[PDB]
Design a protein around this ligand. Sequence first.
Ligand SMILES: O[C@@H]1[C@@H](O)[C@H](O[C@@H]2CO[C@@H](O[C@@H]3CO[C@@H](O)[C@H](O)[C@H]3O)[C@H](O)[C@H]2O)OC[C@H]1O
Ligand SMILES: O[C@@H]1[C@@H](O)[C@H](O[C@@H]2CO[C@@H](O[C@@H]3CO[C@@H](O)[C@H](O)[C@H]3O)[C@H](O)[C@H]2O)OC[C@H]1O
Ligand SMILES: O[C@@H]1[C@@H](O)[C@H](O[C@@H]2CO[C@@H](O[C@@H]3CO[C@H](O)[C@H](O)[C@H]3O)[C@H](O)[C@H]2O)OC[C@H]1O
Ligand SMILES: *[C@@H]1O[C@H](CO)[C@@H](O)[C@H](O)[C@H]1NC(C)=O
Ligand SMILES: O[C@@H]1[C@@H](O)[C@H](O)OC[C@H]1O
Ligand SMILES: [Cl-]
Ligand SMILES: [Cl-]
Ligand SMILES: [Cl-]
Ligand SMILES: [Cl-]
Ligand SMILES: [Cl-]
Ligand SMILES: [Cu+2]
Length: 235
Amino acid sequence: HTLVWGVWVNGVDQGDGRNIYIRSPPNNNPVKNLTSPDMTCNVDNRVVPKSVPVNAGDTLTFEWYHNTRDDDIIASSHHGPIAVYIAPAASNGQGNVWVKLFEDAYNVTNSTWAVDRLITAHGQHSVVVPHVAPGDYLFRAEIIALHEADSLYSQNPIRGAQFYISCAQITINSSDDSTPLPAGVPFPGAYTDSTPGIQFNIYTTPATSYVAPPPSVWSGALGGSIAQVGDASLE
Ligand SMILES: O[C@@H]1[C@@H](O)[C@H](O[C@@H]2CO[C@@H](O[C@@H]3CO[C@@H](O)[C@H](O)[C@H]3O)[C@H](O)[C@H]2O)OC[C@H]1O
Ligand SMILES: O[C@@H]1[C@@H](O)[C@H](O[C@@H]2CO[C@@H](O[C@@H]3CO[C@@H](O)[C@H](O)[C@H]3O)[C@H](O)[C@H]2O)OC[C@H]1O
Ligand SMILES: O[C@@H]1[C@@H](O)[C@H](O[C@@H]2CO[C@@H](O[C@@H]3CO[C@H](O)[C@H](O)[C@H]3O)[C@H](O)[C@H]2O)OC[C@H]1O
Ligand SMILES: *[C@@H]1O[C@H](CO)[C@@H](O)[C@H](O)[C@H]1NC(C)=O
Ligand SMILES: O[C@@H]1[C@@H](O)[C@H](O)OC[C@H]1O
Ligand SMILES: [Cl-]
Ligand SMILES: [Cl-]
Ligand SMILES: [Cl-]
Ligand SMILES: [Cl-]
Ligand SMILES: [Cl-]
Ligand SMILES: [Cu+2]
Protein backbone atom coordinates (compact mmCIF):
# COMPACT_ATOMS: atom_id res chain seq x y z
CA HIS A 1 0.00 0.00 0.00
CA THR A 2 1.94 3.00 -1.35
CA LEU A 3 1.40 6.17 -3.39
CA VAL A 4 3.53 8.85 -5.12
CA TRP A 5 3.88 12.19 -3.24
CA GLY A 6 5.71 14.03 -6.05
CA VAL A 7 8.89 14.10 -8.09
CA TRP A 8 12.32 15.61 -7.95
CA VAL A 9 14.20 16.86 -11.06
CA ASN A 10 18.02 16.89 -10.86
CA GLY A 11 17.76 16.61 -7.08
CA VAL A 12 15.33 19.50 -6.75
CA ASP A 13 11.91 18.80 -5.16
CA GLN A 14 9.05 19.83 -7.48
CA GLY A 15 6.58 19.97 -4.60
CA ASP A 16 3.45 18.05 -3.70
CA GLY A 17 2.15 16.64 -6.95
CA ARG A 18 -0.88 14.77 -5.73
CA ASN A 19 -3.84 15.52 -8.03
CA ILE A 20 -1.72 18.32 -9.53
CA TYR A 21 0.86 16.64 -11.76
CA ILE A 22 0.33 13.06 -10.58
CA ARG A 23 -2.96 11.37 -11.64
CA SER A 24 -3.44 10.25 -8.06
CA PRO A 25 -5.96 7.56 -7.05
CA PRO A 26 -8.02 8.21 -3.84
CA ASN A 27 -6.07 5.81 -1.75
CA ASN A 28 -3.15 3.40 -1.68
CA ASN A 29 -5.10 0.23 -2.56
CA PRO A 30 -3.45 -2.02 -5.12
CA VAL A 31 -4.69 -2.78 -8.59
CA LYS A 32 -4.89 -6.57 -9.13
CA ASN A 33 -7.11 -7.14 -12.20
CA LEU A 34 -4.69 -7.49 -15.17
CA THR A 35 -7.43 -6.80 -17.74
CA SER A 36 -8.86 -3.67 -16.04
CA PRO A 37 -8.42 -0.18 -17.42
CA ASP A 38 -7.06 0.60 -13.95
CA MET A 39 -3.77 -1.02 -15.09
CA THR A 40 -3.07 2.05 -17.28
CA CYS A 41 -2.73 4.77 -14.63
CA ASN A 42 -4.68 3.43 -11.61
CA VAL A 43 -8.35 4.02 -10.68
CA ASP A 44 -8.70 7.84 -11.37
CA ASN A 45 -7.00 8.34 -14.73
CA ARG A 46 -7.87 11.92 -15.82
CA VAL A 47 -5.81 14.94 -16.94
CA VAL A 48 -4.55 16.88 -13.94
CA PRO A 49 -3.74 20.57 -14.20
CA LYS A 50 0.10 20.67 -14.33
CA SER A 51 2.97 18.93 -16.07
CA VAL A 52 6.54 18.96 -14.67
CA PRO A 53 9.09 20.55 -17.07
CA VAL A 54 12.26 18.59 -17.74
CA ASN A 55 14.97 18.28 -20.41
CA ALA A 56 16.44 15.17 -21.93
CA GLY A 57 19.29 13.98 -19.69
CA ASP A 58 17.67 15.21 -16.50
CA THR A 59 17.23 12.86 -13.48
CA LEU A 60 13.53 12.39 -12.67
CA THR A 61 12.93 10.88 -9.19
CA PHE A 62 9.60 9.49 -8.05
CA GLU A 63 8.95 9.74 -4.32
CA TRP A 64 6.60 7.14 -2.74
CA TYR A 65 5.01 7.08 0.73
CA HIS A 66 2.63 4.85 2.67
CA ASN A 67 0.44 7.07 4.90
CA THR A 68 2.44 10.29 5.24
CA ARG A 69 5.51 11.67 3.41
CA ASP A 70 8.85 9.96 4.23
CA ASP A 71 7.37 7.34 6.44
CA ASP A 72 7.91 3.55 6.22
CA ILE A 73 7.08 3.91 2.46
CA ILE A 74 5.59 0.43 1.86
CA ALA A 75 5.16 -2.63 4.09
CA SER A 76 8.33 -4.73 4.18
CA SER A 77 6.24 -7.79 3.28
CA HIS A 78 5.63 -6.39 -0.19
CA HIS A 79 8.82 -7.74 -1.87
CA GLY A 80 8.93 -7.33 -5.59
CA PRO A 81 10.24 -5.46 -8.63
CA ILE A 82 9.96 -1.85 -9.84
CA ALA A 83 9.64 -0.57 -13.40
CA VAL A 84 9.10 2.75 -15.14
CA TYR A 85 7.41 3.25 -18.49
CA ILE A 86 6.88 6.27 -20.76
CA ALA A 87 4.12 7.02 -23.30
CA PRO A 88 3.12 10.13 -25.27
CA ALA A 89 0.47 12.13 -23.47
CA ALA A 90 -1.70 12.33 -26.56
CA SER A 91 -2.30 8.57 -26.26
CA ASN A 92 -3.84 8.91 -22.78
CA GLY A 93 -2.03 5.64 -22.22
CA GLN A 94 -4.15 3.74 -24.72
CA GLY A 95 -2.82 1.43 -27.35
CA ASN A 96 0.63 -0.07 -27.84
CA VAL A 97 2.42 2.93 -26.38
CA TRP A 98 4.25 2.12 -23.17
CA VAL A 99 8.04 1.88 -23.46
CA LYS A 100 10.05 0.53 -20.54
CA LEU A 101 12.82 2.80 -19.26
CA PHE A 102 13.80 0.95 -16.08
CA GLU A 103 13.59 -2.45 -14.45
CA ASP A 104 14.98 -3.65 -11.07
CA ALA A 105 13.90 -6.91 -9.53
CA TYR A 106 16.32 -8.70 -7.24
CA ASN A 107 19.94 -7.69 -6.48
CA VAL A 108 21.92 -10.94 -5.89
CA THR A 109 24.94 -9.09 -4.34
CA ASN A 110 22.93 -7.39 -1.62
CA SER A 111 20.20 -10.09 -1.46
CA THR A 112 17.44 -7.48 -1.76
CA TRP A 113 14.43 -6.90 -3.87
CA ALA A 114 13.74 -3.51 -5.47
CA VAL A 115 11.04 -2.75 -2.93
CA ASP A 116 13.39 -3.49 -0.06
CA ARG A 117 15.86 -0.91 -1.46
CA LEU A 118 13.07 1.57 -2.10
CA ILE A 119 12.29 1.61 1.59
CA THR A 120 15.96 2.28 2.36
CA ALA A 121 15.89 5.06 -0.24
CA HIS A 122 13.02 6.86 1.57
CA GLY A 123 10.71 6.05 -1.34
CA GLN A 124 12.94 7.48 -4.05
CA HIS A 125 13.75 5.96 -7.41
CA SER A 126 14.90 7.67 -10.60
CA VAL A 127 15.17 7.48 -14.35
CA VAL A 128 17.18 9.59 -16.75
CA VAL A 129 14.88 11.43 -19.17
CA PRO A 130 15.51 9.97 -22.66
CA HIS A 131 16.35 11.92 -25.83
CA VAL A 132 12.86 11.66 -27.32
CA ALA A 133 10.85 14.39 -29.09
CA PRO A 134 10.01 17.50 -27.05
CA GLY A 135 6.40 17.32 -25.90
CA ASP A 136 4.04 15.99 -23.25
CA TYR A 137 4.53 12.54 -21.79
CA LEU A 138 3.17 10.21 -19.11
CA PHE A 139 5.71 8.45 -16.92
CA ARG A 140 4.21 5.38 -15.33
CA ALA A 141 5.97 4.06 -12.23
CA GLU A 142 4.94 0.50 -11.25
CA ILE A 143 5.71 -1.47 -8.13
CA ILE A 144 4.66 -5.17 -8.12
CA ALA A 145 4.27 -6.63 -4.63
CA LEU A 146 4.59 -10.40 -4.86
CA HIS A 147 3.63 -11.51 -1.30
CA GLU A 148 0.44 -13.18 -2.58
CA ALA A 149 1.54 -13.77 -6.15
CA ASP A 150 1.66 -17.58 -5.78
CA SER A 151 -2.03 -17.27 -6.76
CA LEU A 152 -3.65 -15.55 -9.75
CA TYR A 153 -6.23 -12.84 -9.08
CA SER A 154 -8.27 -14.15 -11.97
CA GLN A 155 -8.61 -17.48 -10.07
CA ASN A 156 -8.70 -16.19 -6.47
CA PRO A 157 -9.52 -12.51 -6.16
CA ILE A 158 -8.45 -12.39 -2.57
CA ARG A 159 -4.83 -13.06 -3.64
CA GLY A 160 -2.59 -12.25 -6.60
CA ALA A 161 0.22 -9.96 -7.59
CA GLN A 162 -0.46 -6.36 -6.39
CA PHE A 163 0.25 -3.38 -8.63
CA TYR A 164 0.96 0.09 -7.27
CA ILE A 165 0.79 2.28 -10.42
CA SER A 166 1.27 6.05 -10.64
CA CYS A 167 1.35 8.26 -13.68
CA ALA A 168 3.16 11.60 -13.67
CA GLN A 169 2.59 14.30 -16.32
CA ILE A 170 6.00 15.36 -17.62
CA THR A 171 6.82 17.89 -20.30
CA ILE A 172 10.14 17.44 -22.12
CA ASN A 173 11.28 20.84 -23.28
CA SER A 174 14.81 20.52 -24.64
CA SER A 175 15.90 17.34 -26.39
CA ASP A 176 17.88 16.63 -29.53
CA ASP A 177 15.45 13.74 -30.24
CA SER A 178 18.45 11.43 -30.96
CA THR A 179 16.45 8.38 -29.86
CA PRO A 180 12.86 8.75 -31.14
CA LEU A 181 10.35 6.87 -28.94
CA PRO A 182 9.40 3.51 -30.45
CA ALA A 183 6.35 1.37 -30.18
CA GLY A 184 5.50 0.03 -26.89
CA VAL A 185 3.11 -2.29 -25.07
CA PRO A 186 -0.49 -1.85 -23.87
CA PHE A 187 -1.66 -1.54 -20.26
CA PRO A 188 -3.91 -3.32 -19.71
CA GLY A 189 -2.69 -6.11 -22.03
CA ALA A 190 1.01 -6.59 -21.60
CA TYR A 191 0.68 -8.68 -18.50
CA THR A 192 -1.44 -11.81 -18.57
CA ASP A 193 -1.73 -14.80 -16.24
CA SER A 194 1.06 -16.65 -18.07
CA THR A 195 3.48 -13.74 -18.29
CA PRO A 196 6.77 -14.44 -16.53
CA GLY A 197 7.02 -12.70 -13.16
CA ILE A 198 3.23 -12.38 -12.53
CA GLN A 199 2.72 -15.75 -10.74
CA PHE A 200 5.71 -16.56 -8.53
CA ASN A 201 6.32 -17.93 -5.04
CA ILE A 202 8.81 -15.76 -3.23
CA TYR A 203 8.89 -17.98 -0.14
CA THR A 204 10.04 -21.23 -1.76
CA THR A 205 11.51 -20.26 -5.13
CA PRO A 206 14.94 -18.65 -4.98
CA ALA A 207 14.71 -14.95 -5.83
CA THR A 208 17.71 -15.47 -8.17
CA SER A 209 15.28 -17.41 -10.38
CA TYR A 210 12.81 -14.53 -10.67
CA VAL A 211 12.31 -13.04 -14.12
CA ALA A 212 10.42 -9.70 -14.25
CA PRO A 213 7.59 -9.34 -16.65
CA PRO A 214 8.55 -8.27 -20.16
CA PRO A 215 8.93 -6.06 -22.09
CA SER A 216 12.69 -5.64 -21.92
CA VAL A 217 14.11 -2.21 -21.17
CA TRP A 218 14.34 -0.10 -24.36
CA SER A 219 17.87 0.29 -25.83
CA GLY A 220 17.34 4.10 -25.86
CA ALA A 221 16.89 4.22 -22.07
CA LEU A 222 19.59 6.05 -20.13
CA GLY A 223 19.45 4.19 -16.83
CA GLY A 224 18.11 4.86 -13.40
CA SER A 225 18.50 3.84 -9.75
CA ILE A 226 16.73 3.19 -6.50
CA ALA A 227 18.48 5.67 -4.20
CA GLN A 228 17.69 8.76 -2.20
CA VAL A 229 18.45 12.01 -4.08
CA GLY A 230 16.99 14.48 -1.62
CA ASP A 231 15.98 14.85 2.01
CA ALA A 232 12.31 15.38 2.40
CA SER A 233 12.67 16.40 5.99
CA LEU A 234 14.40 19.69 4.94
CA GLU A 235 11.32 21.74 3.56
O1 LIG B 1 6.24 -18.34 6.46
C1 LIG B 1 5.78 -18.19 5.11
C2 LIG B 1 4.37 -17.62 5.09
O2 LIG B 1 4.35 -16.31 5.67
C3 LIG B 1 3.87 -17.56 3.66
O3 LIG B 1 2.68 -16.90 3.72
C4 LIG B 1 2.36 -15.58 3.25
C5 LIG B 1 2.72 -14.57 4.29
O4 LIG B 1 2.37 -13.22 3.80
C6 LIG B 1 0.94 -13.07 3.58
O5 LIG B 1 0.39 -11.81 3.05
C7 LIG B 1 0.10 -10.87 4.11
C8 LIG B 1 -1.24 -10.20 3.83
O6 LIG B 1 -1.47 -9.19 4.79
C9 LIG B 1 -0.49 -8.16 4.71
O7 LIG B 1 -0.84 -7.09 5.59
C10 LIG B 1 0.87 -8.73 5.11
O8 LIG B 1 1.88 -7.68 5.03
C11 LIG B 1 1.23 -9.86 4.21
O9 LIG B 1 2.41 -10.49 4.70
C12 LIG B 1 0.48 -14.09 2.52
O10 LIG B 1 -0.97 -13.99 2.34
C13 LIG B 1 0.86 -15.50 2.90
O11 LIG B 1 0.60 -16.37 1.81
O12 LIG B 1 3.85 -18.89 3.12
C14 LIG B 1 5.17 -19.46 3.03
C15 LIG B 1 5.82 -19.54 4.41
O13 LIG B 1 7.18 -19.99 4.29
O1 LIG C 1 -4.88 -9.37 -0.73
C1 LIG C 1 -5.48 -8.80 0.46
C2 LIG C 1 -4.42 -8.19 1.35
O2 LIG C 1 -3.81 -7.05 0.67
C3 LIG C 1 -5.06 -7.70 2.67
O3 LIG C 1 -4.03 -7.31 3.51
C4 LIG C 1 -4.49 -6.13 4.21
C5 LIG C 1 -4.45 -4.93 3.22
O4 LIG C 1 -4.69 -3.70 3.92
C6 LIG C 1 -3.71 -3.45 4.92
O5 LIG C 1 -4.11 -2.23 5.58
C7 LIG C 1 -3.64 -1.07 4.84
C8 LIG C 1 -2.31 -0.56 5.47
O6 LIG C 1 -1.95 0.68 4.91
C9 LIG C 1 -2.94 1.67 5.12
O7 LIG C 1 -2.49 2.95 4.60
C10 LIG C 1 -4.23 1.29 4.42
O8 LIG C 1 -5.22 2.29 4.66
C11 LIG C 1 -4.73 -0.02 4.88
O9 LIG C 1 -5.81 -0.43 4.04
C12 LIG C 1 -3.82 -4.51 6.00
O10 LIG C 1 -2.83 -4.23 7.02
C13 LIG C 1 -3.58 -5.89 5.40
O11 LIG C 1 -3.80 -6.95 6.41
O12 LIG C 1 -5.63 -8.82 3.35
C14 LIG C 1 -6.75 -9.36 2.60
C15 LIG C 1 -6.28 -9.86 1.20
O13 LIG C 1 -7.42 -10.17 0.41
O1 LIG D 1 -13.15 -8.31 -5.34
C1 LIG D 1 -13.49 -8.07 -6.71
C2 LIG D 1 -14.14 -6.70 -6.88
O2 LIG D 1 -13.39 -5.63 -6.31
C3 LIG D 1 -14.41 -6.45 -8.38
O3 LIG D 1 -15.14 -5.20 -8.43
C4 LIG D 1 -14.53 -4.04 -9.00
C5 LIG D 1 -14.82 -2.81 -8.10
O4 LIG D 1 -14.40 -1.62 -8.78
C6 LIG D 1 -15.10 -1.47 -10.05
O5 LIG D 1 -14.68 -0.26 -10.75
C7 LIG D 1 -15.34 0.93 -10.27
C8 LIG D 1 -16.52 1.28 -11.18
O6 LIG D 1 -17.11 2.57 -10.97
C9 LIG D 1 -16.14 3.67 -11.02
O7 LIG D 1 -15.58 3.73 -12.35
C10 LIG D 1 -15.03 3.36 -10.01
O8 LIG D 1 -14.17 4.48 -10.16
C11 LIG D 1 -14.30 2.01 -10.24
O9 LIG D 1 -13.40 1.65 -9.17
C12 LIG D 1 -14.74 -2.60 -11.01
O10 LIG D 1 -15.35 -2.47 -12.29
C13 LIG D 1 -15.15 -3.94 -10.40
O11 LIG D 1 -14.68 -4.99 -11.31
O12 LIG D 1 -15.23 -7.48 -9.00
C14 LIG D 1 -14.87 -8.85 -8.72
C15 LIG D 1 -14.50 -9.10 -7.24
O13 LIG D 1 -14.00 -10.44 -7.14
C1 LIG E 1 -11.44 -7.30 -14.54
O1 LIG E 1 -11.66 -6.15 -15.31
C2 LIG E 1 -12.49 -6.34 -16.42
C3 LIG E 1 -12.49 -5.05 -17.23
O2 LIG E 1 -13.09 -3.96 -16.56
C4 LIG E 1 -13.87 -6.72 -15.89
O3 LIG E 1 -14.76 -6.95 -16.98
C5 LIG E 1 -13.81 -7.97 -15.03
O4 LIG E 1 -15.09 -8.17 -14.44
C6 LIG E 1 -12.78 -7.75 -13.94
N1 LIG E 1 -12.61 -8.97 -13.16
C7 LIG E 1 -12.59 -9.00 -11.83
C8 LIG E 1 -12.44 -10.39 -11.28
O5 LIG E 1 -12.70 -8.02 -11.07
O1 LIG F 1 -13.18 -0.66 -13.20
C1 LIG F 1 -13.58 0.55 -13.95
C2 LIG F 1 -14.19 0.15 -15.30
O2 LIG F 1 -15.40 -0.56 -15.08
C3 LIG F 1 -14.46 1.41 -16.18
O3 LIG F 1 -15.01 1.01 -17.46
O4 LIG F 1 -13.21 2.14 -16.38
C4 LIG F 1 -12.69 2.65 -15.15
C5 LIG F 1 -12.36 1.48 -14.17
O5 LIG F 1 -11.94 2.01 -12.89
CL1 LIG G 1 1.80 13.84 3.44
CL1 LIG H 1 19.56 5.29 -0.67
CL1 LIG I 1 19.45 16.51 -25.74
CL1 LIG J 1 7.37 -19.94 -8.36
CL1 LIG K 1 19.56 7.60 -11.68
CU1 LIG L 1 -0.11 -3.16 0.58
